[PDB]
Design a protein around this ligand. Structure first.
Ligand SMILES: NS(=O)(=O)c1cccc(Nc2ncc3ccc4sc(-c5ccccc5)cc4c3n2)c1
Length: 244
């Protein structure tokens, strides 16, 4: 728990929930400071949600240095991911990726998700914007503690989230990866997506997506949650593909 051993350098956030800043802890460690707008969250919402994030530990899950809540206002202190959101990285880096690199990114996220799944945590918003790239190229899952383009059917039809809905979400995240940051169903209204999806239509195979990686992406989009593989299973399937 941090008092103010923090140094705010510049920001990067938006929307009531707080701002995010680039900062330093102890004039040393580069960190990402997420503050929360006053009255933008019940104090017990922040308290219990924060202690949940600190109870999670995995190499493909962004880490926390501590929290600030002595009342001035309130902020969560994360390690700094040098390359921002996977969404943004894929976009500006587009055309410079090798299929192998993109597949490695998916494996990174699947690993983090496999951990969250096993720890019975649902991520309800798994997308490229919520993934972070480090000054390694390593991908870590974030924001782990409507967007119908990432929602599975049982979620369209009023919010039945689970670890299997995250898988569907992962399938779309995989599409965003191999398409190098493209927008899924860009020229389609929510209605159209739900209609096209309810007819068995799925996002096309990006060119960088091999016929084998696109089979996997379609298992994630199986209409029935029980038919979708669990992250623990996707990990080994993606792993075997990466091997050729
Ligand atoms: N995605 S960004 O803000 O352009 C950015 C740029 C450069 C570096 C970072 N690295 C970093 N490292 C650890 C983090 C750990 C938690 C959060 S929450 C958040 C956010 C929330 C709501 C709107 C916009 C941003 C960014 C980060 C975060 N971000 C992020």
């Amino acid at each position: 728990i941090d008092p103010s051993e923090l140094t705010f350098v510049q920001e990067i956030g938006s929307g009531q929930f707080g701002l995010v800043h680039l900062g330093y802890w102890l004039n040393k460690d580069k960190v990402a400071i997420k503050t929360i707008k006053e009255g933008s969250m019940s104090e017990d919402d922040f308290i219990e949600e924060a202690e949940v994030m600190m109870k999670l530990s995995h190499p493909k899950l962004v880490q926390l240095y501590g929290v600030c809540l002595e009342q001035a206002p309130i902020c969560l202190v994360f390690e700094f991911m040098e390359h921002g959101c996977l969404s943004d990285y894929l976009r500006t880096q587009r055309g410079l990726f090798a299929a192998e690199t993109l597949l490695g990114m998916c494996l990174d996220v699947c690993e983090g998700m496999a951990y969250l799944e096993e720890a019975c945590v649902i991520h309800r918003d798994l997308a490229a914007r919520n993934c972070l790239v480090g000054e390694n190229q390593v991908i870590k899952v974030s924001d782990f503690g409507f967007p119908v383009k990432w929602a599975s059917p049982e979620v369209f039809s009023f919010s039945r989230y689970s670890s299997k809905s995250d898988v569907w979400s992962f399938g779309v995240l995989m599409w965003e990866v191999f398409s190098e940051g493209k927008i899924p169903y860009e020229n389609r209204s929510n209605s159209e997506v739900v209609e096209d999806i309810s007819t068995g239509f799925r996002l096309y195979k990006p060119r960088l997506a091999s016929t084998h990686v696109y089979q996997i992406m379609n298992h994630c989009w199986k209409e029935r949650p029980e038919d979708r593989p669990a992250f623990s299973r996707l990990l080994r399937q993606l792993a075997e593909i990466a091997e050729s």
